[PDB]
């Protein structure tokens, strides 16, 4: 949870791409430069999209990160995110993340993006009832039962999945922006009671 003594970036962050991300974030000259826990505590935001990162090992020592942009990497294991208790905005599109149990304790998370991860089973997301924004487009999802617990969602994208049953969305009265194009939907009866929708996209269903 903390680095005890000043330590070279490249020792804390074994993924060479992620070490370079941290070096640039802290405006250091080299990944051989040492950092203190106090310097790591100064990091509020990491922008590391499209960076060829395979592991974010070391990120556990960044307790104050609130915004994390990791779209377009080579992640499979997000366990090092487990205890990032202040994370509010998390972008993980275009990785291959399937085990969502590491997200359970991100109790301050407001926005989660997991587009284009090949995901089918989203039952782990039941553990994030405080979410306000959730982006799951371009996956292999059929069963959205668990999203009925996410009663604070105001923006939800499920576009380009394999959903036919949207009954679990019926109770989500705070939804404002709902993106359901490119699914298998023919029956929207359960959405009839949503009163706060501003955007509801349903283009290009494939009935079945």
């Amino acid at each position: 949870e903390t680095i005890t003594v000043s330590t070279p970036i490249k020792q804390i962050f074994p993924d060479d791409a992620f070490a370079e991300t941290i070096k640039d974030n802290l405006k250091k000259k080299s990944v051989t430069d040492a950092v203190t826990q106090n310097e790591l505590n100064s990091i509020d935001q990491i922008i590391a999209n499209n960076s060829d990162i395979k592991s974010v090992q070391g990120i556990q020592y960044l307790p104050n990160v609130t915004k994390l942009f990791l779209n377009g990497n080579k992640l499979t294991d997000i366990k090092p995110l487990v205890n990032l208790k202040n994370l509010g905005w998390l972008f993980l599109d275009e990785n291959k993340i399937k085990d969502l149990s590491s997200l359970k304790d991100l109790k301050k998370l407001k926005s989660l993006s997991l587009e284009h991860n090949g995901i089918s089973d989203i039952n782990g997301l039941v553990h994030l009832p405080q979410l306000e924004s959730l982006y799951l487009g371009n996956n292999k999802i059929t069963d959205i039962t668990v999203l009925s617990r996410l009663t604070k969602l105001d923006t939800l994208s499920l576009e380009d999945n394999q959903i036919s049953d949207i009954v679990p969305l019926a109770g989500l009265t705070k939804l404002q922006n709902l993106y359901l194009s490119k699914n298998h939907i023919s029956d929207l009866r359960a959405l009839a009671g949503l009163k706060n929708l501003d955007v509801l996209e349903l283009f290009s269903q494939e009935a079945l």
Partner: nanobody, 121 residues
Framework: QVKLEESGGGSVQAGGSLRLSCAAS????????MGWFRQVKEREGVAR????????WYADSVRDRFTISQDNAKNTVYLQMNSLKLEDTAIYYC????????????????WGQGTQVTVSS
């Protein structure tokens, strides 16, 4: 791929008004968030609208002086800046994202080139 065509700005006397416009092309979105950030310090959101929807957002410092509106068919938004104040002097940038809650972050947006607005007196 997405072009943001911006117009408007310049110099205006305090208490006066200016209108900015921004037109998006090359996107595929039925609905999307478009509006302005400004920068003097760190950039900050000013106002946005969901083009193809209706929802708007304003920064507290401009509410009730600035009005944002859309022409959905022309993929254009307009910022009517009334009651201009010295504190409004900044570079204003049109900016776009499919999703308004992400638009607010800036980081993932399409960014225009920006226009200088200077308020005098």
């Amino acid at each position: 791929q997405v072009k943001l065509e911006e117009s408007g700005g310049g110099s205006v006397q305090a208490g006066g008004s200016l209108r900015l416009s921004c037109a998006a092309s090359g996107h595929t979105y039925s609905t999307y968030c478009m509006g302005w950030f400004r920068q003097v310090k760190e950039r900050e959101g000013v106002a946005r609208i969901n083009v193809g929807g209706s929802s708007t957002w304003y920064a507290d410092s401009v509410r009730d002086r600035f009005t944002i509106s859309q022409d959905n068919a022309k993929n254009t938004v307009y910022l009517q800046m009334n009651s201009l104040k010295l504190e409004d002097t900044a570079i204003y940038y049109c900016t776009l994202h499919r999703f308004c809650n992400t638009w607010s972050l800036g980081t993932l947006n399409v960014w225009g080139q920006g226009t200088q607005v200077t308020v005098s007196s």
